[PDB]
Amino acid sequence: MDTEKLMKAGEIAKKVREKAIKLARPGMLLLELAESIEKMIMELGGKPAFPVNLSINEIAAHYTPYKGDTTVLKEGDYLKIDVGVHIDGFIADTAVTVRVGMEEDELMEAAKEALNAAISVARAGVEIKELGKAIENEIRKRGFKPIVNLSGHKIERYKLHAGISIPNIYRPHDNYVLKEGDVFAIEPFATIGAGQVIEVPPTLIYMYVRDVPVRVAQARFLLAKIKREYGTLPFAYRWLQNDMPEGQLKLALKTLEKAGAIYGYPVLKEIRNGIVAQFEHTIIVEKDSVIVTTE
Numbered sequence: 027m028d029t030e031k032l033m034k035a036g037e038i039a040k041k042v043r044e045k046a047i048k049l050a051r052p053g054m055l056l057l058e059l060a061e062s063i064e065k066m067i068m069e070l071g072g073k074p075a076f077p078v079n080l081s082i083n084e085i086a087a088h089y090t091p092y093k094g095d096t097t098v099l100k101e102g103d104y105l106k107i108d109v110g111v112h113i114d115g116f117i118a119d120t121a122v123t124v125r126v127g128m129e130e131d132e133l134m135e136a137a138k139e140a141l142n143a144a145i146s147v148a149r150a151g152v153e154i155k156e157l158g159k160a161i162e163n164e165i166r167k168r169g170f171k172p173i174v175n176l177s178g179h180k181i182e183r184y185k186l187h188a189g190i191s192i193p194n195i196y197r198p199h200d201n202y203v204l205k206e207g208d209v210f211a212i213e214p215f216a217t218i219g220a221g222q223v224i225e226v227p228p229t230l231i232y233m234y235v236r237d238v239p240v241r242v243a244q245a246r247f248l249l250a251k252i253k254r255e256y257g258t259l260p261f262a263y264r265w266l267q268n269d270m271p272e273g274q275l276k277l278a279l280k281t282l283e284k285a286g287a288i289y290g291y292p293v294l295k296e297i298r299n300g301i302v303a304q305f306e307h308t309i310i311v312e313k314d315s316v317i318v319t320t321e
C-alpha cells in the first residue's frame with residue numbers, strides 16, 4: 027500500500043525521538059519538552075498521531091504534561107518518551123526510556139532487549155504468542171518483570187489501535203498470525219514491581235469515539251472542534267486549554283465523557299510503585315523479515 031507514508035512517518039518519528047532524548051536534561055520543565063517535541067513533529071511535515079507522552083519513573087504510560095504542569099526532570103529519573111506521528115493517517119509509534127543524566131541501566135536493557143527479540147522473530151505467518159514469549163523471556167531472564175496488562179497494538183490508517191494485541195507475556199491463546207503488510211507496534215514494559223499497572227487520575231488524554239448528541243452548548247462545540255481537528259486520533263487535554271477557561275473545559279470534557287463521545291485514557295501507575303521501563307518500534311510485517319519503520 028502506501029508504505030512510503032508509514033515509512034516517512036516513522037522517519038519523522040525517529041528523528042524527533044532522538045532530539046527529544048537530547049533535550050531531556052535535568053532541570054528541563056516537563057511542559058516544555060512536550061511542546062518542543064510536538065512542535066518539531068509538525069515542523070518536519072508530520073502531524074502528531076497523539077500527544078507525546080512523558081511518563082516518569084513509576085508512572086508507565088499516558089502522562090502528557092499540561093498548561094499548568096510544574097513537573098521538572100530530576101537527575102536519576104526514568105523518563106519514558108513515547109512519540110507518534112502520522113502522515114495522511116499512517117502512523118509511526120516509537121518510544122524510549124531515558125535515565126535523566128545517566129547511562130542505560132540493566133532494567134532499561136531488559137526492555138530494549140525484549141523489543142529486539144520480538145522484532146527478530148516477527149515475520150509473516152507467526153502467532154503473536156511467539157513474540158510475547160520472546161519478550162517475556164528476555165525480561166525475566168535478567169531478573170525483572172514484564173508489565174502483564176500493557177501490550178503492543180496492530181495499526182491501521184487513522185486507527186491507533188486496531189484491536190489485535192501483542193502482549194508482553196506468553197498466552198497460549200494469542201493465536202493471531204502475522205499477515206503480510208500488517209503493521210504492528212511492539213512494546214515491552216519492564217519493572218521491578220508487581221508487574222501490573224493500574225489506572226490513576228488525572229486523565230490528560232482523550233479520544234473521540236462516538237458522534238453522539240450533547241445537550242449543553244459548550245460540549246457540542248468542544249465536541250465539534252474535537253471531531254474536526256482531531257478525528258479518530260487521541261488528543262491532549264492540554265490542546266484544548268486555550269479555547270476555554272479551566273472550570274468550563276473541565277465540565278465540557280466530563281459531559282462528553284458521560285455521554286460517550288470520547289474515551290478517557292487515565293494515567294497508569296505500577297501497582298507497587300515499581301520503576302517502569304519501556305521501548306517500542308513500528309513494524310511492517312513483511313514475508314521474511316519485518317521492517318522497523320522507526321529505527
Ligand SMILES: [Co+2]
Nearest residue numbers: 108119120121
Ligand atoms: Co507508543
Ligand SMILES: [Co+2]
Nearest residue numbers: 119211213306
Ligand atoms: Co504503542
